[PDB]
């Protein structure tokens, strides 16, 4: 365990501010950006599902195709170093091939053990969080996991001096149609767009943004 | 900006492993836990909504009350230093008083300016992410934001040497009934249970868990 002082941790964490305007001349190096991708890869996920894909949109033709409906990051599409569109797994039922592969990656591979795990996953999805019925709720469950990877990538990037902005401000149906249909980047039957993020170096200073006081957020029980 | 080297960031990030069994005698100090809550407070959220409450469940009467349906953390309820149950805002429509407050906290308070922002929020919610036809989709939108705070609190804790585990393994309807109905901790019309996390100091070594290779997660475009 490599342990940092919590004051140093908090200080670096406060580096992260949503950046809408990047220096178009400055690119994140390939090695620096793989480190950001690694924070996403290593993030936790319910049952180790890792129900995400990271679409790195560096092709300016694709950035221009999505600009008309991406008002939340319109300027950044011309100036950001990197763009990631997060995909979340569709129909991640306990009995799906995708979930089976995630179960073996947890180290559960003997057939009787696998059956017992799947039975618990079925009860969780059907009885506890109640998502097995509804395909949109099942998709939203996986989307939730991708916001963990999103948060970790942005935080880690900022601690290392690289700016970012989380992004929901786009038409989700158009984004899926362009990325999956026009450019054929993923099978939209298996994956759906969750959220996006830009990364780069800020063009100017960014003011720290307000938060509600802790006493209006924490409930002590 | 106080900047850390990315190899130092990655090394400290790798401290985080899901911990199911804590040292029951080891308590996180008040100051250290305030630091953890602060990581969640400062987390970003869509339109700065901050649609979360953090219920800190330190009362062992409450912990024992939720244990029978909390199989995902049954042993940790006896041994964890701290437990946080994350609530997400219900019915966070563009025209709700809660969203009005978050908009003023962004520094938009002139009535014509506020009116124009709320018009954009309405279009975002109705047309882009499409969450205004279903109260569950609206609630799930807020739940996604809470997983950012979850990710940041666990990573930051781990970087400072404090173990954690994210938790979905409980009956969600029972959790709301006990926390809101039996113990009156929140108004269930206004807030719903999103996810939980335990925090403490691990009782034994934890093996690093596998992840899919980056080449099966990253789509270069
Ligand atoms: C949202 C969420 C909920 C989870 N729920 C639980 C749970 O209820 N019980 C449990 O033992 N672990 C749970 N985990 C931990 C995962 O099993 C774990 O993150 C995954 O197997 C990867 O292992 P690692 O986190 O140690 O790298 C949860 C993880 C996430 C992100
Ligand atoms: C899921 C999510 C989506 C967001 N969408 C956008 C967006 O489309 N456009 C944008 O300018 N900012 C967006 N933001 C940034 C928020 O406005 C910002 O986090 C919040 O106002 C607080 O500012 P700070 O992040 O600088 O503290 C998003 C944030 C999150 C977490
Ligand atoms: O990740 C896990 O092990 C898990 C997730 C949900 C419910 N129970 C266990
Ligand atoms: O946070 C924001 O400012 C935001 C979120 C979604 C869409 N447009 C803007
Ligand atoms: Cl900016
Ligand atoms: Cl453990």
Residue numbers in the entry:
A (entry chain B), B (entry chain A): 1 to 221
Reproduce the article's own wording on this structure.
Phylogenetically diverse bacteria can carry out chloramphenicol reduction, but only a single enzyme has been described that efficiently catalyzes this reaction, the NfsB nitroreductase from Haemophilus influenzae strain KW20. We found that expression of H. influenzae and Neisseria spp. nfsB genes, but not Pasteurella multocida nfsB, allows Escherichia coli to resist chloramphenicol by nitroreduction. Mass spectrometric analysis confirmed that purified H. influenzae and N. meningitides NfsB enzymes reduce chloramphenicol to amino-chloramphenicol, while kinetics analyses supported the hypothesis that chloramphenicol reduction is a secondary activity.
To understand better how variation in the substrate-binding site mediates activity, we solved the crystal structures of the NfsB homologs from Hi KW20, Hi Int1, Hi 86-028NP, and Nm Z2491. In contrast, Nm Z2491 NfsB was much less active in vitro, with ∼15% the activity as Hi KW20 NfsB (q < 0.0005), apparently driven by a much larger Km value. We found that the NfsB homologs studied here have Km values for chloramphenicol ranging from 160 µM for Hi 12 NfsB to 1,300 µM for Nm Z2491 NfsB, although all enzymes showed apparent kcat values near the median enzyme value of 13.7 s−1 (∼9 s−1 to ∼22 s−1). For example, the N. meningitidis NfsB enzyme has a comparatively low kcat/Km of ∼8 × 103 M−1 s−1 for chloramphenicol in vitro. When expressed in Es. coli, however, it confers an ∼8-fold increase in IC50 and an MIC double the clinical resistance cutoff of 8 µg/mL. For structural changes specific to substrate binding (e.g., nitroaromatics), as opposed to coenzyme binding (e.g., NADPH), we focused on comparisons between the Hi 12 NfsB structure complexed with 4-nitrophenol, the Nm Z2491 structure complexed with nicotinic acid, and the previously published En. cloacae structures complexed with 4-nitrobenzoic acid or NAAD. The phenyl rings of nicotinic acid in the Nm Z2491 NfsB structure and 4-nitrobenzoic acid in the En. cloacae structure coincide with the niacin ring of NAAD in the other En. cloacae structure. Intuitively, the Ser68-Met74 pair found in Hi 12 NfsB would provide more of the flexibility needed to properly locate and orient Trp71 to make space for the ribose of NADP than the Pro68-Ile74 pair in other H. influenzae NfsB homologs (Pro68-Ala74 in Nm Z2491 NfsB). Including the 4-nitrophenol-bound form of Hi 12 NfsB, the root mean square deviation (RMSD) of Cα atoms among these structures are very small with a range of 0.36 to 0.61 Å for the H. influenzae proteins and 0.9 Å for the Nm Z2491 structure.
